[PDB]
Homo-oligomer: A and B are copies of this chain.
Amino acid sequence: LQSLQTYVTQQLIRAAEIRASANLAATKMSECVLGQSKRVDFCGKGYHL
């Protein structure tokens, strides 16, 4: 039972990290692909096209 609890806890923490990464990816899809971004180094180095 202790082993199972340890496993589930670390899975919850990893899932939170992956959720943050997925939110970043969705924002990049909206702002870099559907539009043209004036934010510096968000989409890439240089001037985004």
Residues of A within 8 A of B (CB): 5-6, 9-10, 12-13, 16-17, 20, 30-31, 34-35, 38-42
Total identical chains = 5
- Taking a contact as CB atoms closer than 8 A, the residue among B5, B6, B16, B35 that contacts A13 in the complex is B16
Q: Nearest CB to that of A10 among chain B residues?
A: B12
Chain B residues positioned under 8 Å from A16 (CB to CB): 13, 16-17
Q: Which among B10, B12, B20, B40 is the interface contact of A20 at CB below 8 angstroms?
A: B20
Binding site of A, secondary structure by majority: helix, strand, loop or mixed? helix
Listed from nearest, the 5 A-B pairs whose CB atoms lie closest are: A35-B40, A30-B41, A34-B40, A31-B40, A30-B40
Residue ID in chain B nearest A1 by CB atoms = B2
